[PDB]
């Protein structure tokens, strides 16, 4: 299990691939975005990751579409993007971002991305996983609150499209995540369970080295950690992210641990960090797979008799609403299936909406 992100190997015998996660910590200032890039580079990270798309588009569908409306849906100003990419290319770091639908995917695609990153709550956005898999770039997906079957289904879905360059991140959705909640024994379990996937760890814990290094010495081949330029900035994700020094410190930790392993140096991992190998949601996450993953929702009122289509249902995050049918049924419903009763707009689809009982 190995593949290429840009000019760099990820997986068996390759160095750990380090992603510095900048998020929105540029505070809307382009020069601060360049400074985050600098910090990542000086730290010796492989990749720097920015949020491109706004969270709203994940909970509600937003209505020949104008570029001037498109840009209102993005996190950073569109005029930043080529310059950032240029500046990454010259500081020899790999720019990465996250997609959450077909449209965000297309926007990112238009910049020739090195990999597509998928967040935990889209682990079951199967139409999205299929759509991006067909672009033939590496795919990194996160697994906060997932069980083994979700990980498997996401995996199979990408593989079925002919794309076998997959990395699976273990992750805890709490931020920050107390050490006790790491459950690092999950990393070897996933690696044996998916021996053609490359397995990483997105780290949401505060400490600069204890969980990153323990993960690496349990076999993780990518590490993701948040960083900022200054921890005291009025916290976007500032307060709990690593500052530039701590980032460099983490990297040096990881790289030393790698070379120690090359020498045969053992180093056990604490009971506290190991936790349980049963891949599942934590006590501090609490069944997000039921209330936070995507489902199928009406975007308009649907009337009895009416064909389901791309135009009246969508694969969306529930927010506060009760969950819609699993996204695995989205293709089926839009292939000419019809409502058996009126469905209000903004309501998750349910079996009684599609199954005849009269
Ligand atoms: Zn994160």
UniProtKB/Swiss-Prot annotation:
Gene3D superfamilies: Aldolase class I (3.20.20.70), Antifreeze-like/N-acetylneuraminic acid synthase C-terminal domain (3.90.1210.10). Pfam families: NeuB (PF03102), SAF (PF08666). Pathway: Spore coat biogenesis; spore coat polysaccharide biosynthesis. InterPro entries: AFP_Neu5c_C, AFP_Neu5c_C_sf, Aldolase_TIM, Neu5Ac_N, Nonulosonic_Acid_Synth, SAF. Residues 295-357 form the AFP-like domain. It comes from the Bacteria. One of its GO terms (biological process) is carbohydrate biosynthetic process. This is Spore coat polysaccharide biosynthesis protein SpsE. The gene is spsE.
């Amino acid at each position: 299990a190995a593949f290429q992100i840009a000019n760099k190997t990820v997986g068996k015998d390759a160095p750990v691939f380090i992603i510095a996660e900048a998020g929105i910590n540029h505070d809307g200032k382009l020069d601060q975005a360049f400074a985050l890039i600098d910090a990542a580079a000086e730290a010796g990270a492989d990749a720097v990751k920015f949020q491109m798309f706004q969270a709203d588009r994940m909970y509600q569908k937003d209505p020949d579409v104008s570029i001037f409306s498109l840009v209102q849906s993005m996190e950073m100003p569109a005029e930043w993007i080529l310059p950032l990419l240029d500046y990454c290319r010259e500081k020899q770091v790999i720019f990465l971002s996250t997609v959450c639908d077909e449209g965000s995917a297309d926007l990112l695609q238009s910049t020739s991305p090195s990999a597509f990153k998928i967040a935990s709550y889209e682990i079951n956005h199967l139409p999205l996983l299929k759509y991006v898999a067909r672009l033939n770039r590496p795919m990194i997906f996160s697994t906060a609150g997932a069980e083994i079957s979700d990980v498997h289904e996401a995996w199979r879905t990408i593989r079925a499209e002919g794309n076998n360059q997959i990395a699976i991140m273990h992750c805890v959705a709490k931020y920050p995540a107390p050490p006790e909640y790491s459950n690092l024994s999950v990393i070897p379990m996933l690696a044996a369970a998916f021996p053609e996937a490359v397995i990483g760890f997105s780290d949401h814990s505060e400490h600069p080295t204890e969980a990153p290094c323990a993960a690496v010495r349990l076999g993780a081949k990518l590490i993701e950690k948040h960083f900022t330029i200054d921890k005291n900035l009025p916290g976007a994700d500032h307060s709990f992210a690593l500052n530039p020094d701590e980032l460099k410190e983490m990297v040096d930790g990881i790289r030393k641990t790698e070379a120690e392993l090359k020498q045969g140096i053992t180093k056990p991992v604490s009971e506290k960090l190991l936790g349980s190998s049963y891949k599942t949601t934590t006590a501090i996450e609490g069944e997000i797979r039921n209330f936070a993953y995507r489902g199928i929702f009406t975007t308009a009122p649907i009337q009895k008799g009416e064909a389901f289509s791309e135009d009246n249902i969508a694969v969306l995050r529930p927010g506060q609403k009760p969950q819609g049918l699993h996204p695995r049924f989205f293709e089926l419903l839009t292939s000419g299936v019809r409502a058996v009763r009126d469905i209000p707009a903004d309501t998750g689809i349910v079996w009684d909406d599609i199954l005849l009982k009269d």
